[PDB]
């Protein structure tokens, strides 16, 4: 997260300023939002379009052999 | 004379064997059949409930 103090002081300082804001963590930026929504689609494909907030359920059966 | 002696000897033990072999089998094997299938039936269902508890949680 942190190394070279001579740059680092300013650089890290600007990063925290981000966190210290709630119009986004200082801003967000369209570009990210566009990709987010895309990437969000894809991984739903990755593991099917059910919603794993709920779990599966099954049904039951039998037949006579002879 | 000696022919007839053996002819009934054959036929008699023949029907002894085949009938007694029929008798012994039927009990066990039919007892067999009932329990085998029940087996099969029941098994399936064990799995089917279970698997699912996996599938779902996954």
Q: Which of A52, A54, A58, A60 should one mutate to test binding to chain B, selecting the residue with the greatest count of B CBs within 10 A?
A: A58
Q: Method of determination?
A: cryo-EM
DSSP for B1-58, written as a single string: -HHHHHHHHHHHHHHHHHHHHHHHHHHHHHHHHHHHHHHHHHHHHHHHHHHHHHHHH-
Q: What is the resolution in angstroms?
A: 7.4
Residue A36 distance to chain B (closest CA, Å): 25
Domain boundary assignment for chain A: 1-48
Burial class (CB in 10 A: 0-12, 13-18, 19+), A12: middle
A58 and B48 in contact (C-beta within 8 Å)?
yes
Q: What residues of chain A lie within 8 A of the CB of B45, using their CB?
A: 60, 62
Chain-centroid distance, C-alpha B35: 10
How are the residues of chain A apportioned to helix, strand and coil, as percentages rounded to the nearest 5?
50, 0, 50
Nearest chain B alpha carbon to A63: B41
| Cα–Cα dist A44/A35, whole Å | 14
| CATH code matching the domain that covers A1-48, chosen among 6.10.280.200, 2.40.50.840, 3.20.20.80, 3.30.420.480 | 6.10.280.200
């Amino acid at each position: 997260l942190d190394p070279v103090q001579k740059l680092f002081v300013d650089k890290i300082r600007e990063y925290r300023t981000k966190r210290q804001t709630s119009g986004g963590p200082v801003d967000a930026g369209p570009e990210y939002q566009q990709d987010l929504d895309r990437e969000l689609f894809k991984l739903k494909q990755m593991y099917g379009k059910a919603d794993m907030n709920t779990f599966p359920n099954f049904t039951f059966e039998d037949p006579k052999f002879e | 004379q000696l022919e007839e002696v053996k002819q009934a000897s054959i036929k008699q033990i023949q029907d002894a064997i085949d009938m007694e072999k029929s008798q012994q089998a039927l009990v066990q094997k039919r007892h067999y059949l009932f329990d085998v299938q029940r087996n099969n039936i029941a098994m399936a269902l064990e799995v089917t409930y279970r698997e699912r508890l996996h599938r779902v949680y996954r």
